[PDB]
Amino acid sequence: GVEINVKCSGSPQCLKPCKDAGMRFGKCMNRKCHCTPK
Known about the structure:
- GO terms for molecular function: ion channel inhibitor activity; potassium channel regulator activity; toxin activity.
- The protein has one helix spanning 15-20; strands at residues 2-7, 26-29, 32-35.
- By secondary structure, the protein is of the alpha+beta class.
- The chain has a single domain (2-35), classed as 2-Layer Sandwich (Defensin A-like).
């Protein structure tokens, strides 16, 4: 995925951030959100 500039401690926290970046799947890794390209 693409790393966005949003901090997280679990993947559910990346749902809205990834949607704000135009994307629908992702996960929290290394305390950052990563989102699957549209």
